[PDB]
Design a protein around this motif. Sequence first.
Motif, PDB file in Angstrom:
ATOM      1  N   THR B   3      62.886  50.158  99.360  1.00  0.00           N
ATOM      2  CA  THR B   3      61.722  49.999 100.223  1.00  0.00           C
ATOM      3  C   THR B   3      62.113  49.506 101.614  1.00  0.00           C
ATOM      4  O   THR B   3      63.151  48.864 101.792  1.00  0.00           O
ATOM      5  N   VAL B   4      61.287  49.836 102.601  1.00  0.00           N
ATOM      6  CA  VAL B   4      61.536  49.449 103.980  1.00  0.00           C
ATOM      7  C   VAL B   4      61.701  47.895 104.146  1.00  0.00           C
ATOM      8  O   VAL B   4      62.572  47.447 104.907  1.00  0.00           O
ATOM      9  N   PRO B   5      60.937  47.065 103.396  1.00  0.00           N
ATOM     10  CA  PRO B   5      61.261  45.645 103.514  1.00  0.00           C
ATOM     11  C   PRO B   5      62.663  45.249 103.043  1.00  0.00           C
ATOM     12  O   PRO B   5      63.282  44.381 103.654  1.00  0.00           O
ATOM     13  N   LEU B   6      63.157  45.831 101.964  1.00  0.00           N
ATOM     14  CA  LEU B   6      64.492  45.470 101.534  1.00  0.00           C
ATOM     15  C   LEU B   6      65.512  45.985 102.533  1.00  0.00           C
ATOM     16  O   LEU B   6      66.558  45.371 102.732  1.00  0.00           O
ATOM     17  N   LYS B   7      65.236  47.114 103.164  1.00  0.00           N
ATOM     18  CA  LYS B   7      66.218  47.623 104.105  1.00  0.00           C
ATOM     19  C   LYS B   7      66.299  46.719 105.347  1.00  0.00           C
ATOM     20  O   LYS B   7      67.395  46.421 105.852  1.00  0.00           O
ATOM     21  N   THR B   8      65.130  46.238 105.766  1.00  0.00           N
ATOM     22  CA  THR B   8      64.929  45.492 107.003  1.00  0.00           C
ATOM     23  C   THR B   8      65.106  43.978 106.913  1.00  0.00           C
ATOM     24  O   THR B   8      64.823  43.268 107.885  1.00  0.00           O
ATOM     25  N   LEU B   9      65.539  43.480 105.755  1.00  0.00           N
ATOM     26  CA  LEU B   9      65.554  42.036 105.509  1.00  0.00           C
ATOM     27  C   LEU B   9      66.815  41.440 106.011  1.00  0.00           C
ATOM     28  O   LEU B   9      67.882  41.724 105.495  1.00  0.00           O
ATOM     29  N   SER B  59      67.457  43.666 112.503  1.00  0.00           N
ATOM     30  CA  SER B  59      67.585  44.962 111.890  1.00  0.00           C
ATOM     31  C   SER B  59      66.864  46.012 112.688  1.00  0.00           C
ATOM     32  O   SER B  59      65.865  45.708 113.336  1.00  0.00           O
ATOM     33  N   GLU B  60      67.393  47.231 112.663  1.00  0.00           N
ATOM     34  CA  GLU B  60      66.678  48.359 113.215  1.00  0.00           C
ATOM     35  C   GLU B  60      65.769  48.878 112.134  1.00  0.00           C
ATOM     36  O   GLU B  60      66.076  48.742 110.932  1.00  0.00           O
ATOM     37  N   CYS B  61      64.632  49.420 112.554  1.00  0.00           N
ATOM     38  CA  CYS B  61      63.784  50.083 111.595  1.00  0.00           C
ATOM     39  C   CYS B  61      64.478  51.285 110.889  1.00  0.00           C
ATOM     40  O   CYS B  61      65.281  51.981 111.521  1.00  0.00           O
ATOM     41  N   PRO B  62      64.162  51.547 109.588  1.00  0.00           N
ATOM     42  CA  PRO B  62      64.655  52.746 108.890  1.00  0.00           C
ATOM     43  C   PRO B  62      64.332  53.991 109.679  1.00  0.00           C
ATOM     44  O   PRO B  62      63.175  54.189 110.027  1.00  0.00           O
ATOM     45  N   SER B  63      65.344  54.834 109.858  1.00  0.00           N
ATOM     46  CA  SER B  63      65.367  55.972 110.771  1.00  0.00           C
ATOM     47  C   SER B  63      64.139  56.869 110.727  1.00  0.00           C
ATOM     48  O   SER B  63      63.716  57.400 111.754  1.00  0.00           O
ATOM     49  N   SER B  64      63.605  57.070 109.528  1.00  0.00           N
ATOM     50  CA  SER B  64      62.396  57.863 109.329  1.00  0.00           C
ATOM     51  C   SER B  64      61.122  57.174 109.797  1.00  0.00           C
ATOM     52  O   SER B  64      60.270  57.792 110.432  1.00  0.00           O
ATOM     53  N   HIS B  65      60.994  55.895 109.446  1.00  0.00           N
ATOM     54  CA  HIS B  65      59.774  55.136 109.697  1.00  0.00           C
ATOM     55  C   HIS B  65      59.686  54.373 111.018  1.00  0.00           C
ATOM     56  O   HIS B  65      60.608  54.311 111.829  1.00  0.00           O
ATOM     57  N   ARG B  66      58.523  53.774 111.171  1.00  0.00           N
ATOM     58  CA  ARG B  66      58.181  52.928 112.270  1.00  0.00           C
ATOM     59  C   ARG B  66      57.655  51.791 111.517  1.00  0.00           C
ATOM     60  O   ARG B  66      57.090  51.998 110.479  1.00  0.00           O
ATOM     61  N   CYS B  67      57.803  50.597 112.023  1.00  0.00           N
ATOM     62  CA  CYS B  67      57.412  49.521 111.194  1.00  0.00           C
ATOM     63  C   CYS B  67      56.824  48.352 111.875  1.00  0.00           C
ATOM     64  O   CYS B  67      56.838  48.192 113.104  1.00  0.00           O
ATOM     65  N   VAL B  68      56.316  47.522 111.001  1.00  0.00           N
ATOM     66  CA  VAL B  68      55.631  46.356 111.399  1.00  0.00           C
ATOM     67  C   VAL B  68      56.417  45.180 110.886  1.00  0.00           C
ATOM     68  O   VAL B  68      56.404  44.908 109.681  1.00  0.00           O
TER      69      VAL B  68
END
Lengths: 399, 395
Positions: B3-9, B59-68
């Motif tokens: 998930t994007v939170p685990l990637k961005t943590l 962290s940079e956002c996951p390449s596909s997504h945009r995030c909050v």
Amino acid sequence: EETVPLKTLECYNDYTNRIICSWADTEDAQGLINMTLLYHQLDKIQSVSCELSEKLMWSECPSSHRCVPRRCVIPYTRFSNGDNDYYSFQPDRDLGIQLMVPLAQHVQPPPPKDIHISPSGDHFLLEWSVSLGDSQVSWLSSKDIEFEVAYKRLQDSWEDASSLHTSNFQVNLEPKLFLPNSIYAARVRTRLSAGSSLSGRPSRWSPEVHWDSQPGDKAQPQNLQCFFDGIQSLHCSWEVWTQTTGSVSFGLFYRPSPAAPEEKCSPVVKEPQASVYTRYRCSLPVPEPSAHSQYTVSVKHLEQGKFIMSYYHIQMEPPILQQTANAASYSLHWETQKIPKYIDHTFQVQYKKSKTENLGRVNSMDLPQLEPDTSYCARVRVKPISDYDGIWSEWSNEY
Amino acid sequence: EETVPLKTLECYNDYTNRIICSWADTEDAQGLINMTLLYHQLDKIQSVSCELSEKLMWSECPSSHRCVPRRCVIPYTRFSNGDNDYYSFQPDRDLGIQLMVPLAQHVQPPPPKDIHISPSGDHFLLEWSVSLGDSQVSWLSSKDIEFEVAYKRLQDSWEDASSLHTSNFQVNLEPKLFLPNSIYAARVRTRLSAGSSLSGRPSRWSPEVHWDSQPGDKAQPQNLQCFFDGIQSLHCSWEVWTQTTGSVSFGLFYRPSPAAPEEKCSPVVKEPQASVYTRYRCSLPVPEPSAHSQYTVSVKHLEQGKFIMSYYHIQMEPPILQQTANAASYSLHWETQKIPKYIDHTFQVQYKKENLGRVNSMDLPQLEPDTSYCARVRVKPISDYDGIWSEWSNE
Ligand SMILES: *[C@@H]1O[C@H](CO)[C@@H](O)[C@H](O)[C@H]1NC(C)=O
Ligand SMILES: *[C@@H]1O[C@H](CO)[C@@H](O)[C@H](O)[C@H]1NC(C)=O
């Protein structure tokens, strides 16, 4: 609507005895059927013996087709002024078809039309109308008529879809019949009473009507469907709302009986998918189907986490700056610290007005010289080093 | 798939007092689910308090997504070299789903497969297989299984298609279950015998398989069917082989009761329709239908022909010649005779590229350069009787 051989006919008398007629048939069609010519004089019948020229004597075949020529002579020993001629065509083998249709067992009722979808409330109102004309008693009425409505969600084919039966001209649709966040379609057709004498085809399917189901939690997975292939495998499928899948990861856990240790299914397969819902399926072995075996299957969120330790360190620190040029300005001092006490530092300094130098763990550092302009600027940071790791501290005070 | 939170943590630390962590959830998700962040220590667990950040710190956002992004602080004074830091994300709501499935009542049998379309001389064989496993006793075998085959013409929709029920791994398809020269399709699924205790869903469909039926007359129209719409109307439809309509017209006729006189139903409407066949429809009225009223409907060939009499004629008309080039150059003779005698004649002569009477001779001015040939005539009737201008003669 004129057939080919009749337009290609012209028949012209030679006036001695004979009559000579020229006609044609189509060149794809001579294979399927042949034609015989009829000459009509008062009561005779009389089939004409025909032969085939290489070209229509008196006419032109329709240019779309290309034609097949025919040349026929009818010997006529005597004409008159009152002799009366009619040439007709008929096929050499008597073809046609005939059907007996008892009206009772062949009734296909009129379709429903004027079909509107409206919510009145928590419920959904499906309405339709049917035209029986009049009389009020003519051959069918409220009996023996009944209705069949099929609903499905757009991505489904109609082939498998649920169905309702009411004698009423509208049916109330309530949820639990619906998967919350999707588009549904409904259509009605008129059916004959199972409970009546009259037999035949159901009515034409009504035109479709589309509407969106009641809203739903969206975070939660839905459509949990698990089925057993009668040989040592059980296949469960589920749906989650697509936008959720970046936030949560799901997996499917089973236990045979409500006793056994929970067990994790793999693999889970991702249906591609461009839809607003994304479908998931997993097949789990079921090695010892008991007589009454109740498997208990649930969709729980997978686990997502990491070890961060530390090893990870930031902090931050001020210099005090007592001068800007035009005087003796010696060194610089960094206040806090935030004193770590265990571990080494490698402080970093910078100066002028991108100009820097590396340093040890030292509470202060000395300046060579500057002169004109101002002692400014100089900044500091701290990065944990050796045994311990981490990242440079945010910059300090000045520029 | 993480998930994007685990990637961005990224949790980073300032050893004094607290820890600070930075992570994100998908843009999309924002309305949908509140994730919480957990600090795993020893006994404690202890959900982090977090708030929303302008940017992702480490962290940079996951390449596909945009995030909050979120920013989280935790008040941790006690640390160690041995300390075990583990952070895990979970939704705050209990969201998740649980379903009991007694096996006995949710069973979807294995589908038919390795299915073959098999013609005989007269019949049509339909083959398949089903993989049922072992031991020879596993939960279902010969029973509680059953079968359902659907067959339909290539052009039909499966929604309306004829169905059949067997207990066997093949079927013999009688013709006269099948319209003549035409292309049929068929599929099979596995079902549960009504006798079964087991309940469930019929299996997936076997694949479709295609063949063309018995050959047939083809000059004849097939597929006549009529329906009574229960009020004052009967709707009929039939097909013919399309390239037959060049040779023949068909029409639809009806007798309410057989005793009654044949009526011609009109108009007959033709569908285009793209195929080797052409479909026709016609709807004819009814009286009061008697309760048992028996109708009889036939497709016959419509009458095709045209009148002639005579009123049409053609002939041929020879001249003899006096001579050519510089001896007697005037008039001409006509022969044959070939005597009609009842009608006007109006033969016509030409040198010019001249309408003449019933007379058998014309005279001309002449020239006397060159040679006379070539001179033509014609023979036809006007007034009471008429026909096509005859072919020119001997010239
Ligand atoms: C037409 O007649 C010929 C022989 O006279 C025959 O060979 C042919 O098959 C016939 N056509 C049809 C369509 O029967
Ligand atoms: C959970 O999300 C809602 C979204 O409506 C938000 O308003 C709320 O503050 C969140 N929960 C807490 C405890 O802050």
